[PDB]
Amino acid sequence: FDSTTFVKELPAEEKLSIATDYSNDYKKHKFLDLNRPLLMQILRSDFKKDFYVDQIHRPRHYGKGSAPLFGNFLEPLTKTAWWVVPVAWLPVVVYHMGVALKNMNQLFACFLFCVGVFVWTLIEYGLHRFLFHFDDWLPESNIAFATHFLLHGCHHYLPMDKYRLVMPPTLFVILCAPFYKLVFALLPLYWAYAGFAGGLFGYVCYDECHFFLHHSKLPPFMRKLKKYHLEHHYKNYQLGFGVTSWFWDEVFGTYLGPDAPLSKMKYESGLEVL
Numbered sequence: 001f002d003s004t005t006f007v008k009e010l011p012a013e014e015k016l017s018i019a020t021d022y023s024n025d026y027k028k029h030k031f032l033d034l035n036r037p038l039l040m041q042i043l044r045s046d047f048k049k050d051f052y053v054d055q056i057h058r059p060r061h062y063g064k065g066s067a068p069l070f071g072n073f074l075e076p077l078t079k080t081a082w083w084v085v086p087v088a089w090l091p092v093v094v095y096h097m098g099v100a101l102k103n104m105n106q107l108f109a110c111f112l113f114c115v116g117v118f119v120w121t122l123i124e125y126g127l128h129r130f131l132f133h134f135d136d137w138l139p140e141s142n143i144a145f146a147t148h149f150l151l152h153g154c155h156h157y158l159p160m161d162k163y164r165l166v167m168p169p170t171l172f173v174i175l176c177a178p179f180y181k182l183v184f185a186l187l188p189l190y191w192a193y194a195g196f197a198g199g200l201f202g203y204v205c206y207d208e209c210h211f212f213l214h215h216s217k218l219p220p221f222m223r224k225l226k227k228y229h230l231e232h233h234y235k236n237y238q239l240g241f242g243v244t245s246w247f248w249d250e251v252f253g254t255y256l257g258p259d260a261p262l263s264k265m266k267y268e269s270g271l272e273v274l
C-alpha cells in the first residue's frame, strides 16, 4: 500500500512501480517534494542527519519517468542506462587484460584476473556497507547528505528509477582512480594489468547484475538473489550488502535471513516517535 513502510515479506512486483502521489507525500512526511528538483532541495534543507537517513531509505516512485535532480541543463548527467557500464568499461577490461597476456605467463595472468574478480566482491561488500550506508555515522551537514544521496541514497529513495541505478562513469572514475593507483603502485606492472582488468570486470558484472535484479524477471537460479537484494531495499538496509552474492554477508555476519527484523522508521510527519 504505502511504499515508505518496510514489509516482512515483499509485495507484488507491480506494487513496486506504483507512482507516488507527490503532494500527499510531501505533506505527509515533510521530506522532499518529488515535483521539484531534489538536489538543491537537499543542499538548502533544515534536516538533521537522523531524519535524512530515516527518510531517504523509505522508497518512493516517480512513475514511468525520472525525477529531476537539477531540473536544468545538467540533468542529462544524472541519467545513465544499464548498457552504459558495459560499453564504457569492457573495452578497458579487454585492453588491460590483452596487455598482460602478451607480456606475462598467460596462465598466471588468467589467475590474477580471477583474484581481481574476487577482490571486487569484497570491495562491493565494503563500499556498499561502509561508504554507501554511512548513514548514522553522517555529519550534520547538507553537503554530506547530498554526497550520500548521489552515491547511493537516491537509489534507495527511488529503487525503480531505471536511469539512476547503475553508476555514472563520471562518478565511477572518481572512486576507481584510487584503486587503479594502488594496484599499479603495489603489484608488478603486468600483474596490475591482469589484476585491474579482473577487478574492473567484476565491477561491470556487479552493476549489470544490480540493474537486472530490480528491472527483470531473471532465470530461476538468480531469482532468489533477487529476493535477497530486494529485501535490502524493502525490509532491512542494515543487512544484505552483497548483491552479486551474500558470501561476504555470511562471512561478516550481515546475512539477510528470513526472520531478520524490519528497519526502524524513526520519524513520522516530520517528528520523531518517543
Ligand SMILES: CCCCCCCCO[C@@H]1O[C@H](CO)[C@@H](O)[C@H](O)[C@H]1O
Pocket: 077, 078, 079, 149, 150, 151, 152, 154, 155, 164, 165, 166, 167, 168, 170, 171, 172
Ligand atoms: C554530478 C555528476 C552526476 C551525478 C549523477 C547522480 C546520479 C547518482 O547515481 C548513483 O550512482 C551511484 C554510484 O556512483 C550508485 O550507487 C547509485 O545507485 C546511483 O543512484
Ligand SMILES: CCCCCCCCO[C@@H]1O[C@H](CO)[C@@H](O)[C@H](O)[C@H]1O
Pocket: 081, 083, 086, 087, 162
Ligand atoms: C551492451 C550493448 C547493448 C545494446 C543496446 C541494447 C538495446 C537497448 O534497448 C533499450 O532498452 C531500454 C531499457 O531501459 C529501453 O527503455 C529502450 O526502449 C530500449 O531501446
Ligand SMILES: CCCCCCCCO[C@@H]1O[C@H](CO)[C@@H](O)[C@H](O)[C@H]1O
Pocket: 082, 086, 208, 215, 216
Ligand atoms: C554484460 C551485459 C549483460 C546484460 C545483457 C542483458 C540483455 C538484456 O536484454 C535487454 O533487456 C532490457 C531490459 O532492461 C530490455 O529493455 C531490452 O529490450 C533487452 O534487449
Ligand SMILES: CCCCCCCCO[C@@H]1O[C@H](CO)[C@@H](O)[C@H](O)[C@H]1O
Pocket: 081, 083, 087
Ligand atoms: C551502444 C548504444 C546503445 C544505444 C541504446 C539505445 C537506448 C537509447 O535510445 C533511446 O533512449 C531514449 C531516451 O529518451 C529512450 O526513451 C528509448 O527507450 C531508447 O531507445
Ligand SMILES: CCCCCCCCO[C@@H]1O[C@H](CO)[C@@H](O)[C@H](O)[C@H]1O
Pocket: 117, 120, 121, 202, 203, 205, 206, 221, 222, 225, 244, 245
Ligand atoms: C562479481 C561477479 C562474479 C560473482 C561471484 C559470486 C557469484 C556466485 O553466484 C552464485 O553462485 C552459486 C553457486 O553456489 C549459485 O548457486 C547461484 O545461482 C549464483 O547466484
Ligand SMILES: CCCCCCCCO[C@@H]1O[C@H](CO)[C@@H](O)[C@H](O)[C@H]1O
Pocket: 204, 205, 206, 208, 209, 212, 216, 217, 218, 219
Ligand atoms: C552479470 C550479468 C547479470 C545479468 C544477467 C541476467 C540478465 C537477465 O536479463 C534478461 O534478459 C532477457 C533478454 O532480453 C530478457 O528477456 C529477460 O526478461 C531478462 O530477465
Ligand SMILES: CCCCCCCCCCCCC
Pocket: 092, 173, 176, 177, 180, 181
Ligand atoms: C580507469 C579508472 C580511472 C583511472 C584513473 C587514472 C588515474 C591517473 C593514473 C596516472 C597518474 C597520473 C598522475
Ligand SMILES: CCCCCCCCCCCCC
Pocket: 112, 115, 116, 119, 120, 123, 127, 175, 176, 179, 180, 183, 195, 196, 198, 199, 200, 203
Ligand atoms: C589483485 C588486485 C585487484 C584490484 C581490483 C581493483 C578493482 C577496481 C574497481 C574499483 C571500483 C570502485 C567502485
Ligand SMILES: [Zn+2]
Pocket: 155, 159, 210, 214, 229, 233
Ligand atoms: Zn538496489
Ligand SMILES: [Zn+2]
Pocket: 128, 132, 133, 152, 156, 232, 237
Ligand atoms: Zn543499499
